[PDB]
Amino acid sequence: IFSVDKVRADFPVLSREVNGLPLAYLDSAASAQKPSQVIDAEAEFYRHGYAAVHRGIHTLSAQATEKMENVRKRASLFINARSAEELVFVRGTTEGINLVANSWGNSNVRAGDNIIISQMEHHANIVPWQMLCARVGAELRVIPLNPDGTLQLETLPTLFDEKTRLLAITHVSNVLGTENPLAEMITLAHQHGAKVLVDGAQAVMHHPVDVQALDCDFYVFSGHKLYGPTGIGILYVKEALLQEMPPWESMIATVSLSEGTTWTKAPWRFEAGTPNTGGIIGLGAALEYVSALGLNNIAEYEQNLMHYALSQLESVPDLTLYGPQNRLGVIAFNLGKHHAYDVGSFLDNYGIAVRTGHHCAMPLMAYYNVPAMCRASLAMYNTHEEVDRLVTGLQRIHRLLG
Amino acid sequence: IFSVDKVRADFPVLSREVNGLPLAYLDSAASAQKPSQVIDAEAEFYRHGYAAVHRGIHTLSAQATEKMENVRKRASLFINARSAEELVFVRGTTEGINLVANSWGNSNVRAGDNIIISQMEHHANIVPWQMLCARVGAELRVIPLNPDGTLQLETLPTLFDEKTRLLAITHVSNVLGTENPLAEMITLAHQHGAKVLVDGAQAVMHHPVDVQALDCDFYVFSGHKLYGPTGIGILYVKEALLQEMPPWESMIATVSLSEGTTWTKAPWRFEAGTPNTGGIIGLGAALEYVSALGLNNIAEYEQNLMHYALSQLESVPDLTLYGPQNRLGVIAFNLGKHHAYDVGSFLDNYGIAVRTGHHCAMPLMAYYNVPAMCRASLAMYNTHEEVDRLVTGLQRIHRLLG
Ligand SMILES: *Cc1c(COP(=O)(O)O)cnc(C)c1O
Ligand SMILES: *Cc1c(COP(=O)(O)O)cnc(C)c1O
């Protein structure tokens, strides 16, 4: 079945030394390492198939245009969209959410309306809605957290009303690892006539995602967290909404100095300038690589690795964990009264890469009354030995610093 | 001493066959091929140095952050900016111009003002200004063309008045190869208190560019036309202007659900989300590669190649050329009454890649009373033998089709 030894052999960076020690990279939630299959797919495109892709007549350009559109089709099958034309290539999740907030938001949210977010959102799924509610005179409502890191689902009937136009909600928390009950939340939102955008940047690498089963109206994720290149992400929009969305800024179609400007049809309408064809080719290879391993195989390995880490972390004195027992992907923690950045600095000195800080989720930190947390990511190429290095390191820090 | 043979050996795509014949890639103005040094720099980053850059403290993240900031410094020296912090990493020229129009334009162009562009502008340097003039109620004024493809410089003094806020002008036309007299135009604009944005997307690969000597207020170009990766470009803004530009839509600094949002300072203010670190590393390698060849050496070789091409094209019956005698980089043409797309399709049969259509410059096409043109690019890796194949192919099409 799944062999972590064979998976690790695909990732050249895992041989790196840091501070003279073999790297234990526990920060895939910030960005994932890339297998050779992804790196080489992008390089081979540049070495042998590169051209511009904007309606070029010559053979190299026509073949490159086909490669790009085949990646759009592969991505649409990956999330089980009904049509490839429901997918927009964006620069990343941040840009995809802002695109919805401006194109769809400015045309559908008006004075007196409200938008619902949650207290656990990444800043990228808060600020565009704060700005939009400021542009039009709408109200931003917030689903509160429970101490265990889940959302208070029972507050949703009170927060929704006939003026709620959109729920913007994370699939999986980037700090807590919480997987939100999207199917139930989407059912409730649609009864009030609201749309639902799902921030899926921390979900698509952990298990299969089916946007038709979810029935979400928008879904966004980032290529670089899905073992792929930087500078590329995917925005999915239901065709009925996407074909109605007005232009934002293969996007400009015609220009006249006397008659004005027209724009191309969606999804190309929202892909201005020159595509990041290199990143698109690499992203396609990342989807092929993940699919070849099998997302259910990945989910089982990662779930068993998480269970091992949580059981082992019970032997660390004065450790505080944040989030639910059934967390996906990440473990958020603090050690005693020590500053998160000090804990992170000692772990780095032991060759272990974790992330410390507010993790672009300051309202979440405020809820737990801390300035920062440490966060360890446990991805499909991580091992028991790396978990053991984390646990023994935390025990070592507690012994030395009290 | 420039050797085209030594240069061509660095570009693996040039060994490609198209339609069974050795490739003659005459479309670098659409997008440039990349040397192995650029492809490998990006791949080596992914293989051995990859991490997130958003102020991560662990060793790999700190090192990746330093690599990105070293590229910003290298790019600032490449265009002779005063400070590396005058440069913003943008997705491309299209996005860079829109950034200026939305942050600077919305704060400096008001009802009753005017903006001046030219009739030869790329759509990306037209539409942002058309839409801004509609958001605020300003007038868009246009420098007309001459038959030889130069701008009517003598009309500028009457187009400028005390209400002119900005001149947006191309350094080198992407269709005609006209190099505009920026020194005179910038001197005139500044006498009226206007700022100047220069679209330099077709200039920076052909000769040295010095933004202090030009004294332009904004300068923008694209990485993929400068032998670099897709998905990355550069926006230069004078420091005094850049630090006054407000945010539009590391960019988010702090988020509070009760107190609102703050943003980072420029240039980072205008780099939202996750940087395209792969493309930045490759862009750095492209600047190194070009600087090692020498832009004055590149300019000399390309000018002699252009002179040879224009002399040889005189032997083609029914050939119409568009543009001035001292064109840079590109030759725009049509053959008899034949459709440009048909000419390009036949050349593609001979293994020759040219671009056809309106080249994102429909007002230019309308001036010449044609729907489209063919465009051959003559870059630093092109040769006399490729020119000869273009000439022979055009002669063949004229013989076959009339
Ligand atoms: C990383 C992340 C984002 C931002 O994604 P970018 O690709 O950096 O724009 C948004 N939401 C979540 C949950 C994330 O983990
Ligand atoms: C290519 C080009 C643009 C657009 O640049 P992108 O990287 O595609 O955004 C704008 N202006 C000129 C003159 C160009 O040649």
Peptide bond into B144 cis (omega under 30): no
What is the identity of the amino acid at A340? A
DSSP secondary structure of B242-304? HTTPPP----EEEEETTTEEEEPPTTGGG--SS--HHHHHHHHHHHHHHHHH-HHHHHHHHHH
Report how far residue A178's alpha carbon sits from residue A146's, in angstroms, rounded to the nearest whole number. 11
Sign of CA dihedral A145, A146, A151, A152: negative
Tokens representing residue B42 in the block = 């990006």
Nearest CA in chain A to B134: A260
Contacts of B246 in chain A (CB under 8 A): none
Sign of CA dihedral B187, B191, B193, B194: negative
Helix/strand/coil for B321: strand
Contact present, B26 and B376 (Cβ < 8 Å): yes
Report CA dihedral (A304, A306, A308, A311) to the nearest 10 degrees: -130
Report how far residue A323's alpha carbon sits from residue A150's, in angstroms, rounded to the nearest whole number. 7
Contact present, B49 and B67 (Cβ < 8 Å): yes
Tokens representing residue A271 in the block = 């892909």
* 3-state DSSP of chain A: CCCHHHHHCCCHHHHCEECCEECEECCCCCCCCCCHHHHHHHHHHHHHCCCCCCCCCCHHHHHHHHHHHHHHHHHHHHCCCCCHHHEEEECCHHHHHHHHHHHHHHHHCCCCCEEEEECCCCHHHCHHHHHHHHHHCCEEEEECECCCCCECHHHHHHHCCCCEEEEEEECECCCCCCECCHHHHHHHHHHCCCEEEEECCCCCCCCCCCHHHHCCCEEEEECCCCCCCCCCEEEEECHHHHCCCCCCCCCEEEEECCCEEEECCCCHHHCCCCCCHHHHHHHHHHHHHHHHHCHHHHHHHHHHHHHHHHHHHCCCCCEEEECCCCCCCEEEEEECCCCHHHHHHHHHHCCEECEEECCCCHHHHHHCCCCCEEEEECCCCCCHHHHHHHHHHHHHHHHHHC
Structural biology method used:
X-ray
Tokens representing residue B312 in the block = 């040889």
Task: Name, in order, each residue with C-beta under 8 angstroms of A205's C-beta and a sequence gap of 6 or more.
Answer: A32, A225, A226, A227, A290, A298, A329, A379, A380
From its phi and psi, is residue A60 left (phi > 0), alpha (psi between -120 and 50) or beta? Answer: alpha
Nearest CA in chain A to B54: A30
Report how far residue A256's alpha carbon sits from residue B169's, in angstroms, rounded to the nearest whole number. 17
Contacts of A101 in chain B (CB under 8 A): 249
Report CA dihedral (A255, A260, A264, A266) to the nearest 10 degrees: 150
Report how far residue B26's alpha carbon sits from residue B306's, in angstroms, rounded to the nearest whole number. 12
Helix/strand/coil for B324: coil
Report how far residue A287's alpha carbon sits from residue B57's, in angstroms, rounded to the nearest whole number. 30
Report how far residue B168's alpha carbon sits from residue B166's, in angstroms, rounded to the nearest whole number. 6
Q: How are beta strands A355-357 and A373-377 bridged, if at all?
A: antiparallel
Residue B332 β-bridge partners: B322, B375
Whether the CB of A63 is below 8 Å from some CB of chain B: the reply is no
Report CA dihedral (B63, B66, B67, B69) to the nearest 10 degrees: 160
CATH architecture of the domain A32-293 equals 3-Layer(aba) Sandwich (3.40)
Report how far residue A104's alpha carbon sits from residue B196's, in angstroms, rounded to the nearest whole number. 33
Sign of CA dihedral A303, A309, A312, A313: negative
Contact present, B101 and B152 (Cβ < 8 Å): no
Peptide bond into B267 cis (omega under 30): yes
Nearest alpha carbon to residue A107 among A195, A205, A229, A219: A195
User: What's the order of all strands across the beta sheet hosting B114-118?
Assistant: B87-90, B233-237, B218-222, B195-199, B164-170, B114-118, B139-143
Report how far residue B76's alpha carbon sits from residue B57's, in angstroms, rounded to the nearest whole number. 26
Task: Name, in order, each residue with C-beta under 8 angstroms of A92's C-beta and a sequence gap of 6 or more.
Answer: A222, A223, A224, A231, A232, A233, B273, B274
Tokens representing residue A213 in the block = 């089963």
Contact present, B371 and B384 (Cβ < 8 Å): no
- CA of A373 vs chain B CAs: smallest distance (Å): 13
Nearest alpha carbon to residue A52 among B112, B28, B279: B28
**Is A231 within 8 Å of B276 when comparing Cβ atoms?**
yes
Contact present, A367 and A349 (Cβ < 8 Å): no
Tokens 């907030």 found at:
A101
Report how far residue A36's alpha carbon sits from residue B40's, in angstroms, rounded to the nearest whole number. 13
CATH architecture of the domain B37-293 equals 3-Layer(aba) Sandwich (3.40)
Give me the residue from A38, A48, A261 closest to B13, CB to CB: A48
Tokens representing residue A348 in the block = 């780095």
What is the identity of the amino acid at B401? L
Contact present, A32 and B51 (Cβ < 8 Å): no
Q: What is the resolution of this structure in A?
A: 1.5
Fold annotation for B2-36+294-397:
Aspartate Aminotransferase, domain 1 (3.90.1150)
Rg (CA), chain B: 22
CB pairs under 8 A between A and B: 247
Query: What separation in angstroms does the CA of B329 have from each of B79, B289, B376?
Result: 19, 19, 9
**Per-domain residue ranges for chain B?**
2-36+294-397, 37-293
Contact present, B125 and B199 (Cβ < 8 Å): yes
Tokens representing residue B383 in the block = 């040769």
Distance (angstroms) between ligand 2 centre and the Cα of B64 equals 28
From its phi and psi, is residue A177 left (phi > 0), alpha (psi between -120 and 50) or beta? Answer: left
Contact present, A10 and A356 (Cβ < 8 Å): no
Report how far residue B278's alpha carbon sits from residue A36's, in angstroms, rounded to the nearest whole number. 15
Tokens 């797309």 found at:
B341
Q: What are phi and psi of A253, to 5 degrees?
A: -100, -60
Helix/strand/coil for B343: helix
Report how far residue B216's alpha carbon sits from residue B236's, in angstroms, rounded to the nearest whole number. 9
Tokens representing residue A115 in the block = 């938008």
Contact present, B363 and B126 (Cβ < 8 Å): yes
Contact present, A322 and A333 (Cβ < 8 Å): yes
User: Burial letters for B303-334: b for 16+ Cβ neighbours within 10 Å, e otherwise?
Assistant: bebbeebeeebeebeebebbbbeebbbbbbbb
DSSP secondary structure of B175-203? TT-PBP-HHHHHHHHHHTT-EEEEE-TTT
Distance (angstroms) between ligand 1 centre and the Cα of A221 equals 7
**Is A48 within 8 Å of B257 when comparing Cβ atoms?**
no
Number of neighbouring beta carbons within 10 Å of residue A383 = 17
Give me the residue from B39, B49, B95 closest to A47, CB to CB: B39
Angle among Cα A306, A356, B70 to the nearest 5 degrees reads: 120
Report how far residue B202's alpha carbon sits from residue A335's, in angstroms, rounded to the nearest whole number. 55
Angle among Cα B25, B36, B379 to the nearest 5 degrees reads: 30
Angle among Cα A63, A69, A72 to the nearest 5 degrees reads: 150
Helix/strand/coil for B378: coil
Window B:313-342, CB contacts with A under 8 Å: 341
Tokens representing residue A363 in the block = 């309202």
Report how far residue A132's alpha carbon sits from residue A110's, in angstroms, rounded to the nearest whole number. 9
Angle among Cα B339, B344, B345 to the nearest 5 degrees reads: 95
Contacts of B279 in chain A (CB under 8 A): 230-231, 276, 278-279
Tokens representing residue A267 in the block = 């999804």
Q: What are phi and psi of A140, to 5 degrees?
A: -100, 115
Task: Name, in order, each residue with C-beta under 8 angstroms of B194's C-beta and a sequence gap of 6 or more.
Answer: B116, B160, B164, B165, B166, B167
Q: What are phi and psi of B181, to 5 degrees?
A: -80, 75
Tokens representing residue A369 in the block = 């009354």
Whether the CB of B103 is below 8 Å from some CB of chain A: the reply is no
Q: How are beta strands B218-222 and B233-237 bridged, if at all?
A: antiparallel
Please state the length of chain A.
402
Give me the residue from B52, B255, B348 closest to A127, CB to CB: B255
Nearest alpha carbon to residue B125 among A56, A273, A269, A91: A273
Report how far residue A155's alpha carbon sits from residue A22's, in angstroms, rounded to the nearest whole number. 47
What is the identity of the amino acid at A299? A
**Is B50 within 8 Å of A13 when comparing Cβ atoms?**
yes
Report how far residue B313's alpha carbon sits from residue A151's, in angstroms, rounded to the nearest whole number. 71
